[PDB]
Amino acid sequence: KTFFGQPLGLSTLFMTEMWERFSYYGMRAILLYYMWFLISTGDLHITRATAASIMAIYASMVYLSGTIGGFVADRIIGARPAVFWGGVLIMLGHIVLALPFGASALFGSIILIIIGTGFLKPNVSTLVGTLYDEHDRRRDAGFSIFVFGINLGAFIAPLIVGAAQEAAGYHVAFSLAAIGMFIGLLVYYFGGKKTLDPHYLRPTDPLAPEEVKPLLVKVSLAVAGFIAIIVVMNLVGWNSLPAYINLLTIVAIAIPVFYFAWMISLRVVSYIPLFIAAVLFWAIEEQGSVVLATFAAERVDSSWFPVSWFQSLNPLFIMLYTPFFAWLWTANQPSSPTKFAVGLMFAGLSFLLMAIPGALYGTSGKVSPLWLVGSWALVILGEMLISPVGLSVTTMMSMWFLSSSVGSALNAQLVTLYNAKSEVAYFSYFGLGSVVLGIVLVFLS
Ligand SMILES: CCCCCCC/C=C/CCCCCC(=O)OC[C@@H](O)CO
Ligand SMILES: CCCCCCC/C=C\CCCCCC(=O)OC[C@@H](O)CO
Ligand SMILES: CCCCCCC/C=C\CCCCCC(=O)OC[C@@H](O)CO
Ligand SMILES: CCCCCCC/C=C\CCCCCC(=O)OC[C@@H](O)CO
Ligand SMILES: CCCCCCC/C=C\CCCCCC(=O)OC[C@H](O)CO
Ligand SMILES: CCCCCCC/C=C\CCCCCC(=O)OC[C@H](O)CO
Ligand SMILES: CCCCCCC/C=C\CCCCCC(=O)OC[C@H](O)CO
Ligand SMILES: CCCCCCC/C=C\CCCCCC(=O)OC[C@H](O)CO
Ligand SMILES: CCCCCCC/C=C\CCCCCC(=O)OC[C@H](O)CO
């Protein structure tokens, strides 16, 4: 008796991640529209450009937090508690938004989820490997099944949450996200005790006595320096929300900039164009929940259904393409930098495609939802070529997990350029921009 030929414990982690991704992407599907709403009532004193920038940097921090959660679990708290307490903080983040508050709750919600996802996201995948011996040939299948559960949650969430927001408002919809995470915790907690190794209740590589102090010092210097920067910023008058957002953008981009300059000082050099292509691809893919969400709400005949449902197309196409590419890579298979190149080209085509309706019809009307369907089909096609390979090429493993954070940080700057007047230029310029760089990468391949 198995779960698709895998140890029964996979069923627990499958559901755990399905519900967490439900909570996360359910929130993402309506958070931007929610900020627009708070703005329209005068409760939130920012522009839509800033709100769009917030969504991008929010994403950026979540991915950044993810590069740290594995360490904290491996060295300090253990993978099993990390997942649990991460789940708790994620649940509380969605509760904060469900409470009878407005803009005052946004920061607290954002922080809780950044930290919680940081503890949960890397460590659930770790525990999946825990199910198998070193020997097990079933590993690749088990992770594929796990990924399917991730995509499932991401798929149903905007449908269910978006419908709920339409029927019962934002606060109820945010509560559904919280309940989703809660369900994830129930199944995880009770299902875990039956199936998970008690070894992972504790860290597997705990700090040795002599490691405690320098780690505390290292963490301390970072906080003091970051706090110092913020003090100076407020002294010299750089203290607006766009300013803090720029600071985090700089931070998110500096980290890979430093580790490279650190490590360089020589095939690492060859990894640079790969890393650049990854950042750019993630930038475009992550604009689906920001720029494309804006386009869906302003430029699409979506009178008969919640416009947040467009967020379901991303994981839908992942699920549709997946068994195909599963087959395709079994049946000369192109190289890895070739995949990145063609992978970035498809991202570029997805934005080039979106420039068409504005150029043909104008930007003051509404167009068919099919334009967005086509756009997402194109970008996810690019994801099938880049994501399954990116970790393999880089084998700096962290560099791979950071490419998504840098793309989002870059987006935090770029998405402020998008509006009805700049629609066609935005899509053409960046669409073509990414296509040419994918052409360059073929030359450098
Ligand atoms: C996996 C590869 C797929 C590539 C996607 C490209 C195919 C479709 C592109 C967009 C279709 C155009 C819209 C069709 C339509 O019914 O237009 C009606 C009109 O209301 C438009 O405003
Ligand atoms: C152990 C805790 C787990 C449970 C998760 C927390 C969620 C439980 C109940 C959520 C109640 C929804 C909020 C109701 C509400 O504010 O109504 C909004 C009002 O504006 C109606 O339009
Ligand atoms: C080890 C990697 C991290 C190192 C970070 C390097 C530099 C950190 C901070 C410096 C950036 C200055 C802040 C910029 C800023 O807030 O400008 C805002 C202003 O233009 C808007 O009103
Ligand atoms: C408007 C028309 C655009 C047509 C574009 C066609 C050309 C695209 C790429 C040209 C070079 C081939 C790349 C093949 C390759 O893998 O490397 C070899 C290349 O470096 C040859 O010099
Ligand atoms: C009286 C109100 C407060 C009660 C709620 C607080 C939380 C209750 C129990 C905490 C349990 C800690 C879980 C840590 C953990 O590793 O869980 C993992 C599971 O064992 C499965 O892996
Ligand atoms: C998730 C909780 C927050 C931890 C971050 C604080 C980082 C700074 C110093 C590390 C604190 C670790 C405390 C426990 C510890 O490692 O000491 C005992 C050693 O295992 C044995 O000497
Ligand atoms: C077996 C695969 C089938 C799909 C093939 C992919 C199609 C590739 C390019 C299609 C054409 C480019 C989009 C332009 C477009 O939508 O024009 C349509 C009219 O403008 C609609 O009013
Ligand atoms: C592989 C080919 C797939 C099919 C797409 C081919 C080209 C797609 C779009 C080209 C431009 C579409 C609109 C043209 C346009 O807006 O003309 C500009 C007018 O002068 C506006 O005043
Ligand atoms: C699978 C095919 C993918 C589709 C890509 C083909 C189309 C590429 C670019 C189309 C749009 C080009 C720019 C149009 C443009 O800016 O014209 C000016 C407008 O009239 C004013 O904004």
Author numbering: 6 to 270, 280 to 345, 349 to 412, 423 to 472
What does the paper say about this structure?
To address this question, we determined high-resolution crystal structures of a bacterial homologue to the mammalian PepT1 protein from Streptococcus thermophilus, PepTSt in complex with physiologically relevant di- and tripeptides in addition to a peptide-free apo form. The POT/PTR family contains a number of conserved sequence motifs and a conserved architecture consisting of 12 or 14 transmembrane α-helices arranged into N (H1–6)- and C-terminal (H7–12) bundles 3,10–12. Conserved pairs of salt bridge interactions coordinate structural rearrangements that lead to the vectorial co-transport of peptides and protons across the membrane 3,11.
The movement appears localized to the C-terminal bundle and occurs following intra-helical bending at residues Ser431 (H11), Asn328 (H8) and to a lesser extent at Asn156 (H5), the latter two side chains making direct H-bond interactions with the Ala-Phe peptide. The cytoplasmic ends of H10 and H11 form an intracellular gate with a hinge region located around Gly407 (H10) and Trp427 (H11) 3. C Zoomed in view of H11 showing the formation of the hydrophobic pocket around the phenylalanine side chain of the Ala-Phe peptide (coloured helices) and the dissolution of the pocket upon adopting the more open structure observed in the Apo structure (grey). The structure of the Ala-Phe complex suggests that the closing of this gate around the dipeptide results in the formation of the hydrophobic pocket, which forms to accommodate the bulky phenyl side chain of the ligand.
